[PDB]
Symmetry: D2
Subunit: 99 residues, 4 copies
C-alpha cells in the first residue's frame, strides 16, 4: 500500500457516460509540471501508488487504483500521470460527498 | 539549498501596496490539507526550503525565501505554510512573466 | 407569447435530481444577480415573462423552456432569480453538449 | 445624457498600463459577449450610448466613466465590446476595493 492525496481541482475526471462509474483521473498540466519538478510522482514510482486520497471542500475520499494500469499520457509540454480507478464510485455520490 | 515547486494557483500572494514587492505567499487551505496528508511540507521540514519555484501558464520562476521566517499560520481546519520572499520581485514583472 | 433570455452557464447554480438526473431548476449566482439588479435585466415584475433560457457555454448554446409561473426570487444582500426547467434534460447529455 | 451599465468584473479582461498603473480599457470575455449578443444587451448600434460602467464584484460596486466615442467591437466566433476608461483608477486602489 502507498497512498497519495491529490486535491480534486488538479484532476480531470472521466465518468462513464458522464454520470456513471469513475473510470480514470488525469492530472492537470500545471500540477503535472509542478510534480515533475518535485519528483512527487515519476514514471519510475507511479505504479507504487495503490490509493488516491481525493481532497476537496475540506473533505477526503480514498479510492483504490489499479497500479498496473497507471501510465503517463502526452501532454502541454510534458506527459501527465493517469490513474485507473478500482474502487467503484459513481458521479452522484461523488458530487454528494464533495458538494 | 532545497527547492520546492508550487503552482501559483495554490498560493495567496501578498504584494506590498497590492502592486509593489512580493512580501509573502500563503498556501491555500485545500492544497495545505493535501500537503498535510502527504507530508510534502511539514512543521518539521518547512525551514529546509530555500527556494520556491512558482509554476503557472507553462512557465516557472524561482524565488528565494527567508528560511528562518517560514511558519504555519491558523487555518479552515488545519494550519497553512507561509513563506517570506527574499528575491525582490514586483507585481508588474510577475504579471508580465505569467501573463 | 415567447420571451427568451440567454444566460451564461457559469452564472447559474444547477440543481440536478439526484445530482445526475433531470435538471430541475437553475438559480442565478449572487454576483450576476446584483448586476441584473442594477441593470433591471431580470426583475420581480418581469421574471414571469421569460418562457425560455438559452444556456451559453464553451461557445455552444442550449435553449430550455421554463415553467414561467414557477419563476421566483429567493433569499441569497440581494434576492436572486430561480427558474424551474420544463424541457427535460439530464446531466449526461448536458455535460455531453457543453463538455 | 448619461447611460450606465453594470458588468460583473469576472466578465472583463482589464488592461492596466504597465500591469500595475492606470486602468486603460476593459474588454468583455467571449462567453459573456455571446450572451450579450443573443440578448442585444450591448450592440454595435447602442454601445456608444454607455457613459458609465458599474463594475460589480465581491458584493461591491465601482462606477467608472468611459470615453463613449472610443467604445468599439474587436475580433475575439463573435466580436466583443471594448470600453476605454475615462475615470482615473489604478490597480492598487482597484484591488483594495474589490479584494
Amino acid at each position: 500500500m502507498k497512498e497519495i492525496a491529490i486535491q480534486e481541482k488538479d484532476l480531470t475526471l472521466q465518468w462513464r457516460g458522464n454520470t456513471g462509474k469513475l473510470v480514470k483521473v488525469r492530472l492537470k498540466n500545471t500540477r503535472a509540471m509542478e510534480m515533475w519538478y518535485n519528483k512527487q510522482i515519476t514514471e519510475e514510482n507511479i505504479q507504487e501508488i495503490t490509493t488516491l486520497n481525493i481532497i476537496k471542500n475540506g473533505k477526503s475520499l480514498a479510492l483504490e487504483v489499479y497500479p498496473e494500469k497507471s501510465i503517463y499520457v502526452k501532454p502541454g509540454r510534458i506527459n501527465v500521470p493517469v490513474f485507473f480507478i478500482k474502487t467503484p464510485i459513481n458521479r452522484g455520490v461523488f458530487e454528494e460527498i464533495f458538494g
